[PDB]
Symmetry: D2
Subunit: 393 residues, 4 copies
């Protein structure tokens, strides 16, 4: 275990090393709505997309905590990069549910392979000899422009067209065609465009049931390494929350950094630190962000402990983790509003990084897996053993 | 009084009549960072910049409540337009502190005259024969590109250069030169650029002491009409809050309008109205916005009552009004965050008006006169008769 | 109308006149869990139980606003008295749904008649010749010990025992028997004991359908005076909220009164007013209480306007009023927690009135008609025209 | 270290073993305002007052985390007992700053010795031959009736009467005289009465400077065991917060336990679990309590890590811990208000444990060391290196 703490220290140190490159390409990504080439280069050199890739394929093969800690530091430099990087690892982790044939095809000669994934069942597939024929239109395809493969969920149907089952299908970039639909006010460089397919062929070995994609049966398998025992869907939500969290932490640091050089208009306080109302308010806001940090870590640690222990997390724990992530990001978005008040009107200038953290965090926070209202109802429901209101845990 | 309620109904009806024009020019203003010509035309035709202009100059000469109600409806169509319109009236109201010579020069042949004003003392003036010589750089000059005059606050100095007093100075557009400094993520079309002057001459009749600009001695003057008895600085803050409020109300209406046609991902709720967690949350959020509405109205009514009654508002009332406006906008920005949660990820699309209300309201809310933390300390301080932490009330 | 504002001023002045008597009997009522005789005397002398009694029976016959304003001032002296007084008027207002025979029997020779009422259907009634035979056990019978009659809701059944309909039944104190069940930590003097009946006879003229008790058909009846056109159930909730509100306002006044004579342990602030963190926080807390005040008044005014105008309030307005009252009391209970923080450890001493307001307001706030969560779901539901989750409006 | 986790499991198991006795004496303690004899017996048998007593004196000598975890479970049975128990250990820990002579006198033949302590400098002491002469009146003396000694802070003065320095003085029960001043609405059995002294003699060996009482110089001393390297004042605040936290957790468990057997009046929801508005709200409230739990643990772990590592905590860390404890208890008191709303009117019945947790937690939370507003200003101030607003850290 002392190894995994040491590795984290190195990967966090890499983010600081490569950070300047990510920070350098912020303006272009905002402008173009995709990651600059220098950034993608840096992501590939740094191996930050390989944290949840297996060691057998030359990956780093870390744990949930390490990915989270890396995510939070990355968001300081560029929230979009942090979001793409984390979604790639999460997508790479989900690919471990596919057969060895698929995994070998994807990672065999590509240690730094990068996957996209959209779980919304936006397509229909039919049985054809040797595999499936897939058609659909999948929005919110994060980082699809730079990814090698994509995991797409679809609804299987028969010759007549009646639904028979859910599928999770791994298709390469060569078969992909991407529509430009990502025009947003935050997380712009994420390039979460729509993936389109039209009668695209997918072989048997690169298709699993959606029922098997959600599986946590690997939790008790001693043959697998700890990482692949982890509850992947929960783990993905945790690291996504870390991206949002990290942006909020950067917003706090900035407001602290600039407070002694600014006043509170139109008050007598020429310095923001001179106002004890400002200081206590900032102390309060900081403690909310600290709570969100403790929330994300609690969940990350629960997933890591169970993975190493090779025990299956009960539904109640998974339901609680979904509440933790929703609560954490909800605290951050409220904290950001409080930080804009603390800073003042200059925060909304395009030259100011504060509005950038504000916009990126707020946009990313409304990801399905981070829904605070759904999270509350899930966690609240676990106390009475009610039916989960979401299909996947 | 039944007249002033009838007039409001007509002016609100005008906003709806001209609204389509304002709504039509939203995309261009966002792009260009200034109001389209059709909008400025509509503002001049509608007389919405003449609400706080005197009847003797062919103005409408209404009251605080009416301006507020017009402001809130305007924000539905374009928050930037609402902000410019309201700042013009407020600036026009502040001009009534100047001598008749200035007022005649400004409004004599221009019933629809539009003033800018920045109160931050960003310039220095010296005595010269017949007037003053003024130099400075004044940021945040709202709607300056379309305005005829500008009220600029400056610090008077002597031949040696030692501060002697504060001044409020009315200078025309012909003497103005505007720097392009307004690059923001919200309230973009407001064109709050920097006003620059360099050894510009201002005559005696268009200069008053800053000490007289803040004056509320007109409160008891029965010679003046009610409007000009009103506490102008307080009244300006109230209508500014109305702009922010109105945006929040439009955000609420939109979320209500779209809820039955959307789901809550990734939950079983295919319709947002099917979730009672969604409905109660929306009910709660709506009640916060309702409180902000009641806050702004309370203040508006206090100012109007005293103006018609010809009584001077004590400091405690003015201090309370400053708390009301800060509280109202603080509730709206928090409510907007809650509405983004209610709506979901689609809210951050550029095609969606929700992120537009969100950004515009949040940017405008950090106006000095709307500072929530300062407002709290002011109102709290009035309970114990502490010294106000702001110079103007 | 200038009369009803003048009358309010007098009735508020009466509360101050008789206030010392109510304040004098606080300690005894706390001890004995019922109102002292001096208090009941004062209630009868002051006519504060006759505000919603008809003028034809020698009552004051005021409006919702006046009752609310009286309620808020009463809570300063003794919250329990305020609660009893307001419940009596509300119960007296509900009696106007009964036939003239009942009203004459109740108010004919008793202008200062005081009714109790519990709406929870805790009893069953059967048809007998000339009336009904009633049996049941009704908890939460506020002020029953001092009341002359009681309005009890029951479920009608047949000889076999199958439910047939809902009833509202007016029975006198002579037929009542009261069980001592009111052992609480707040609102102790309210004496909300359980009313018990056993095969008690109730004649036809003192029984109406529960369906007619909830009726708002009197809203458009020009024959009735304005008061009896008012939506009684909504009006009762509003004045109940006023009792809770008034306690919160008294808590605020006390904290303001004592702040300059106390410190903030263990800080350097020997005076609470010396801490600007304390002052701004108090300013914030005060603004929440101000919002609750504006909420209650908004609702009161909506009910009064419609009553005088003789128009029926649509469900949406009534649903909104239920949200207003729940929001108002929710703000007050949160504000009280904030005021305890402001004051400090001395607040929880039995000698300190602050913990008394705290306990009384918190207990009363959980009245069914003041349920904040139900209120939110009701008001939220009105936006989409959903079925109300409560039977009565 | 695996020992200290094992010991905790046993001490938590002891609280459950002896819990029934504490729970049994709740009604009497509430009535009499002091701990029943069976409780004091149980405290002495269980060794729960000996957690922060040295092993050399036959104590358990645990750490901050263990005391905290024991505190939280104790509050389930009786919050007052938990508060007394924790204050005794904290007082016993502070006694380690005194010389060996004092420690031997106190703990030499009394392994289960129980100390009181009040830090408010409410007394004056003068130099006399062989020691000091002490006079004063010290309020809030928790558990003084059952304690063997008391640590009292005083101001040293000269023959003339001018202040010279601060003192911390250890005096036995034989020299104590206790005034009955503890009449409160929560934490009643704590018996926090006033300690009075009149020209009482205190020898040199049982007196240290207040300057040495606050000392953290023991942090780096490898001669001392880890427990006595811990920052005692910070550690005391942490365990006090644990008492409040534990009460809030018990309130949550109760509301969860009773929800399926209760309805939400006056709604259609016959069961509380049937309302998804109730469930999500409870989920939200639970997450606030979870945050407070994570706050207290974070602080406890920071103190324990530094103690075992033998490093001195910088001021910034100590300032942060003071923010954590204030935030945690602030979350709990707000959470309790939310839980009363969830439960309903039955919560305020004297027979219901919910109002007991509510009152006890709220009273205890206003302890100086748990002041949320002071905590915010302290933690906020650490970001800019401002002077601490409290004398002790
Ligand atoms: C920046 C961003 C990226 C997202 N990426 C993905 C993704 O990669 N895969 C996915 O399944 N869902 C993703 N989502 C989920 C998406 O938010 C929901 O499906 C969304 O709520 C759909 O509703 P709508 O409002 O867009 O219509 C993402 C959301 C955001 C904001
Ligand atoms: C959209 C907007 C318009 C503003 N317009 C004006 C104005 O017209 N006049 C003025 O005096 N101040 C105005 N202000 C005030 C301005 O916000 C403050 O002076 C500001 O806090 C200065 O601090 P800074 O952070 O910009 O540096 C405006 C602020 C905003 C956000
Ligand atoms: C102080 C108080 C007085 C109340 N008085 C009445 C009343 O007079 N009539 C009534 O119908 N309901 C009254 N209620 C309503 C009562 O709160 C609800 O019926 C309650 O929620 C029942 O649930 P329970 O938790 O008591 O069980 C009162 C509540 C309180 C706290
Ligand atoms: C239940 C309780 C116990 C307390 N016990 C102690 C104590 O043992 N020692 C101490 O120094 N302070 C203690 N305090 C601190 C006390 O709260 C403060 O000194 C208090 O704020 C003094 O202000 P006042 O409002 O009582 O006057 C305690 C407070 C409470 C509520
Ligand atoms: C939930 C679970 C897994 C996922 N992979 C990509 C998106 C996404 C959402
Ligand atoms: C405060 C008072 C008046 C003002 N006029 C323009 C800005 C502004 C701010
Ligand atoms: C709701 C409506 C009317 C009522 N009368 C007494 C209680 C009560 C509750
Ligand atoms: C702060 C620090 C230490 C203490 N001991 C007893 C009370 C108390 C408060």
């Amino acid at each position: 275990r002392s190894e995994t703490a040491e590795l984290r220290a190195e990967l966090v140190e890499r983010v600081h090393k490569f950070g300047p490159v990510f920070a350098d390409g912020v303006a272009e990504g905002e402008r173009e709505r995709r990651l600059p080439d220098a950034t993608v280069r840096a992501i590939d050199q740094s191996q930050l997309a390989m944290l949840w890739t297996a060691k057998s394929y030359g990956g780093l093969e870390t744990d949930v905590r390490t990915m989270s800690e890396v995510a939070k530091v990355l968001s300081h430099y560029c929230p979009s990069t942090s979001w793409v990087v984390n979604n790639v690892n999460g997508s790479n982790l989900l690919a471990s549910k596919f057969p060895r044939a698929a995994l070998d095809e994807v990672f065999g000669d590509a240690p730094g392979a990068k996957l996209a994934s959209v779980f919304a069942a936006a397509g229909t597939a039919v049985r054809t000899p040797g595999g499936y024929r897939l058609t659909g239109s999948w929005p919110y395809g994060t980082g699809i422009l730079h990814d090698d493969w994509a995991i797409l969920v679809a609804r299987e149907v028969d010759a007549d067209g009646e639904p028979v089952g859910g599928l999770s299908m791994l298709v390469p970039a060569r078969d992909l065609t991407v529509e430009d639909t990502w025009h947003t006010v935050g997380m712009r460089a994420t390039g979460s465009h729509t993936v389109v397919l039209r009668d695209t062929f997918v072989p048997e070995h690169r298709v699993i049931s959606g029922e098997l994609q959600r599986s946590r049966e690997s939790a008790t398998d001693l043959g697998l390494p700890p990482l692949f025992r982890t509850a992947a869907i929960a783990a993905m939500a945790v690291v996504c929350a870390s991206v949002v969290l990290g942006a909020g932490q950067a917003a706090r640091a900035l407001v602290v950094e600039k407070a002694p050089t600014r006043g509170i208009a139109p008050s007598k306080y020429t310095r923001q630190t001179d106002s004890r109302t400002f200081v206590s308010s900032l102390g309060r806001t900081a403690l909310s962000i600290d709570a969100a940090e403790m929330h994300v870590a609690r969940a990350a640690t629960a997933l890591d402990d169970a993975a190493y222990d090779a025990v299956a997390l009960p539904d109640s724990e998974l339901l609680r983790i979904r509440g933790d992530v929703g609560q954490a990001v909800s605290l951050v978005t409220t904290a950001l509003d409080e930080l804009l008040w603390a800073h003042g009107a200059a925060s909304f200038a395009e030259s100011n990084p504060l509005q950038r953290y504000w916009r990126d965090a707020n946009t990313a926070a409304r990801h399905a897996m981070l829904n605070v209202h759904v999270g509350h109802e899930l966690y609240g429901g676990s106390f009475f053993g009610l039916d989960p209101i979401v299909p996947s845990l």
